[PDB]
């Protein structure tokens, strides 16, 4: 190759020209690679829960509802290429995969996760008069990805 | 609310069908406006076509019935920590699953002017939109048939 | 193997798709469901100490969606020694956790040591890391740039 490098393919002249470049190429791109940023993402969850220093009874159900804390997080995914959903739950795991780490240890309840990607038409089972969902279920049907949130997060 | 702040589109597994600029440059006279350089990142583009990354779709069987033989076959409710809190339940699987898959791409970029002298070792480079090396590139074979035009 | 005292326990080279560590938890530093949650993610090669896998003379690599980053040489074999941090967690013992309600909360630091058919999990000391190293994890979960 090296010595060949020196020698010249010599297209001539007294008339310049050009070339028709056709080209073949293949790639193996994992849908959730990091280099294409199908890996990261920010979002803030609940990280603290208490009340200001006196534990129970009159506010034993109400003390729990008095101090909340939020913080921004860049959490990541394991590279690969996953089904429409798979991806979702992967975050909807790694979003929990943060909670478990900081939520339990600081009074945060599963109740108040606060960030949940999910496909579904909560409200589909609605009704006008009750102004609620008559089957007692957010009718478990796939519609299109969606992000459910709690206050602040 | 947000119907204005944003817009509802479809689920793209490719998530960002990106383009990529092909640019060998010790061959082509460099198209118009590009300055000649040897900074891997600028490299006068010889042609661009988008990624060989597209999306195929299938029919996830009976949607949610594929999901109940997946909350039971996974052995764990790993994602689905809460199989009762209507809100926190591993989202329904969609009727239709989508998969990022890559095909190969054969493309004709057109015809371009080339220097009248090519060094036996041509260097080719496939640049990505934000102009850089994409290492997910597998095998890229460009061939180019020279041809005449004009005259002095 | 059989003919020379090698145990099934110590096979040492097992290609496999799976995200051992998915069922992880921070505090136990183990897998809470007592299962490497049986889910397909992407081909991976699990190894034991000393044993490895060289592809040089083969392409299957490309199938295993695993490939050298300077695809043009040969430092390309994979040894237990390379998958750093990518050791399988170890797995947690479920039953030990269960029965344990003695008066108490300790109940479970006990990470499953060997499976029912008594095949060992070569757990190691510390009891939170089985010396089973897997491609995926190391790459994806553990090792920055080293």
């Amino acid at each position: 190759p090296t010595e060949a490098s020196t020698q010249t393919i010599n297209f001539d002249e007294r008339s310049r020209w050009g070339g028709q470049l056709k080209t073949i190429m293949h790639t193996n791109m994992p849908n959730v690679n990091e280099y294409m940023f199908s890996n990261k993402f920010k979002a803030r969850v609940m990280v603290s829960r208490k009340a200001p220093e006196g534990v129970t009874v009159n506010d034993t159900y109400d003390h729990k509802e008095d101090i909340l804390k939020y913080e921004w997080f860049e959490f990541i995914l394991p590279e690969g290429n996953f089904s429409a959903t798979m991806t979702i739950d992967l975050m909807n795991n790694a979003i929990i995969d943060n909670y478990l780490e900081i939520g339990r240890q600081n009074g945060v309840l599963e109740s108040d996760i606060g960030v949940k990607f999910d496909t579904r038409n909560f409200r589909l089972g609605w009704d006008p008069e009750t102004k609620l969902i008559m089957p007692g279920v957010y009718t478990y049907e796939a519609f299109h990805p969606d992000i459910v949130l709690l206050p602040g997060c | 609310g947000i119907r204005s702040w944003t817009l509802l589109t479809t689920s793209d597994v490719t998530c960002g069908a990106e383009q990529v600029y092909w640019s060998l440059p010790d061959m082509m006279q460099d198209p118009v406006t590009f300055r000649s350089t040897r900074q891997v990142n600028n490299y006068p583009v010889v042609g661009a076509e988008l990624m060989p990354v597209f999306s195929k779709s299938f029919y996830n069987e009976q949607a949610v019935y594929s999901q109940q033989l997946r909350q039971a076959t996974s052995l764990t409710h790993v994602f689905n920590r809460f199989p009762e809190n209507q809100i926190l339940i591993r989202p329904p699987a969609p009727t239709i699953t989508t998969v990022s898959e890559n095909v190969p791409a054969l493309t004709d970029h057109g015809t371009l002017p080339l220097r009248s002298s090519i060094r036996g070792v041509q260097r080719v480079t496939v640049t990505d939109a934000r102009r850089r090396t994409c290492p997910y590139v597998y095998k890229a074979l460009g061939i180019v048939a020279p041809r005449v035009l004009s005259s002095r | 193997g059989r003919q020379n005292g090698v145990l099934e326990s110590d096979i040492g080279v097992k290609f496999d798709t799976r995200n051992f560590r998915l069922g992880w938890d921070p505090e136990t530093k183990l897998i809470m469901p007592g299962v490497y949650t049986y889910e397909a993610f992407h081909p991976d090669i699990v190894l034991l100490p000393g044993c490895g896998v060289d592809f040089t003379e083969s392409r299957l690599s490309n199938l295993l969606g695993i490939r050298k980053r300077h695809p043009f040489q040969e430092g390309f074999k994979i040894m237990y020694e390379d998958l750093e941090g990518g050791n399988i967690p170890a797995l947690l013992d479920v039953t030990a956790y269960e029965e344990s309600k003695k008066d108490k909360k300790e109940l479970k630091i006990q990470p499953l040591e060997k499976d029912s058919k008594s095949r060992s999990y070569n757990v190691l000391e510390d009891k939170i890391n089985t010396a089973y190293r897997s491609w995926y994890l190391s790459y994806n979960y553990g090792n920055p740039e080293k």
Partner: peptide, 10 residues
């Protein structure tokens, strides 16, 4: 809290 209700697999 282990956050995984045990025995919920059918």
């Amino acid at each position: 809290n282990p956050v995984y209700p045990y025995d919920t697999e059918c």
